[PDB]
């Protein structure tokens, strides 16, 4: 095990946002991760009517960011090299609207100042979560605003919370797809802080450090999860078309306090994002919209090629794997 969480087949023709007086709910998930990271707040809100949600990482001072987008199905807004917030949401491309709610709320907080240096920058990424439920409800401006309003320092709701409400893994065949969640992990090493946040909605499965498939591609007929490569290789061996459902992505953030140059931060982002092919397999496929944000608060100076980015990247890769395993738990 763990116990199966099959998504089950969606019921088509379900209601959308116009059918409801949508009430934002503060997401608490299955448990709260507590950590110490001054200047970073996290909020998560959902609509039970979906169920679908949004998770917002708010860094009020603004933070330098690198964006690494992979796959054929990325859903991204802004992708800025400097952000006051990162907004992760369900609802496919429709859920990018949640980031507009964050942006608008930040503008209002700044008393509608619009000097170029005062622009409030929100980058948003989405997962397609419509197959995992029987409604067309999407995260909207009101839900992004709610997630920001619910944001507090040093807390993250694990599991079915915010953007993770209806995330799912293992999409060779929808009959074997399982609900994941969102996950976070945190490490402090001296003054160095690393926070990983992930919403895995992959076509692939979640894999632990022993190589065990722990979430996704669960066959009710056998009681066992299978690495998708075994399904693909048997399709090719039998000379029949392989199958896989569209509507997949993993959207993620690494937040650190270590000062990194733009080149270091971008190389760091690419290394950490590639590392996730250990815990999610396959990963970075044409079916996926994989988007990682690497964010630094530029607080700590560590003592032409960067050993510091490489070493920090290796550690952050482990924090991110732990976050993926929390999402699949």
Residues of this chain that bind its own copies (CB under 8 A): 12, 14-18, 72, 75-81, 92-94, 96-97, 100, 103-104, 107-108, 112-117, 119-122, 128, 130, 136, 138, 140-141, 245-247
300 binds, among its own copies, Na ion, none (CB under 5 to 8 A by kind): none
Is residue 218 within 8 A of residue 176, CB to CB? The reply is yes
Q: Residue holding tokens 């799912």?
A: 168
Contacts of 228 (CB under 8 A, 6+ apart): 170, 172, 203, 204, 205, 217, 244, 281, 282
61 binds, among Na ion, its own copies, none (CB under 5 to 8 A by kind): Na ion
- For the bound state, the minimum distance from the C-beta of residue 301 to Na ion, rounded and expressed in Å, comes to 13
Q: Breaks in the chain, named by the residue before each, with C–N above 2.5 Å?
A: 303
State how far the Cα of 278 lies from the Cα of 197, in Å rounded to an integer. Answer: 16
297 binds, among its own copies, Na ion, none (CB under 5 to 8 A by kind): Na ion
Instruction: Considering the complex, state which of residue 149 and residue 298 has its C-beta at the smaller distance from Na ion.
Output: 298
> Strands 52-70 and 290-300, how do they pair?
antiparallel
- For the bound state, the minimum distance from the C-beta of residue 111 to Na ion, rounded and expressed in Å, comes to 10
- For the bound state, the minimum distance from the C-beta of residue 228 to Na ion, rounded and expressed in Å, comes to 24
Contacts of 74 (CB under 8 A, 6+ apart): 125, 249, 289, 290, 291
State how far the Cα of 320 lies from the Cα of 185, in Å rounded to an integer. Answer: 7
- For the bound state, the minimum distance from the C-beta of residue 63 to Na ion, rounded and expressed in Å, comes to 6
15 binds, among its own copies, Na ion, none (CB under 5 to 8 A by kind): its own copies
- For the bound state, the minimum distance from the C-beta of residue 117 to Na ion, rounded and expressed in Å, comes to 8
Instruction: Considering the complex, state which of residue 115 and residue 223 has its C-beta at the smaller distance from Na ion.
Output: 115
């Amino acid at each position: 095990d763990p116990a199966p969480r099959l998504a089950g087949p969606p019921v088509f023709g379900g209601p959308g946002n116009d059918a409801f007086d949508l009430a934002p709910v503060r997401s608490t998930g299955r448990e709260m991760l507590r950590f110490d990271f001054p200047g970073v707040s996290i909020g998560a809100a959902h609509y039970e009517e979906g169920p679908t949600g949004a998770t917002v990482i708010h860094i009020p001072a603004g933070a330098r960011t690198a964006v690494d987008a992979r796959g054929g199905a990325v859903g991204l807004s802004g992708g800025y090299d400097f952000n006051h917030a990162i907004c992760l949401a369900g609802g496919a491309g429709y859920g990018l609207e949640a980031g507009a709610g964050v942006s608008d709320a930040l503008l209002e907080r700044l008393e509608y100042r619009t000097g170029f240096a005062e622009l409030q920058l929100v980058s948003s990424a989405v997962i397609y979560d419509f197959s995992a439920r029987s409604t067309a409800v999407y995260p909207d401006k009101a839900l992004g605003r709610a997630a920001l309003e619910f944001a507090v320092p040093g807390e993250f709701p694990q599991g079915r919370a915010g953007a993770g409400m209806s995330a799912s893994a293992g999409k060779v065949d929808w009959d074997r797809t399982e609900i994941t969640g969102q996950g976070a992990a945190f490490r402090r090493l001296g003054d160095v802080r690393i926070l990983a946040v992930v919403v895995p909605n992959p076509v692939g499965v979640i894999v632990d450090r022993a190589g065990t498939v722990v979430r996704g591609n669960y066959d009710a007929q056998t009681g066992v999860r299978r690495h998708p490569v075994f399904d693909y290789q048997e399709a090719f061996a039998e000379q029949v078309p392989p199958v896989t459902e569209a509507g997949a992505a993993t959207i993620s953030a690494i937040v650190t306090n270590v000062r990194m140059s733009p080149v270091e931060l971008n190389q760091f982002a690419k290394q950490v994002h590639s590392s996730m092919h250990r815990g999610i397999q396959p990963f970075h496929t044409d079916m996926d919209g994989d988007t990682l944000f690497a964010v630094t608060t530029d607080e700590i100076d560590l003592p032409r090629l960067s050993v510091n980015a490489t070493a920090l990247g290796a550690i952050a890769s482990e924090v991110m794997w732990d976050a993926v395993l929390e999402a699949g738990k």
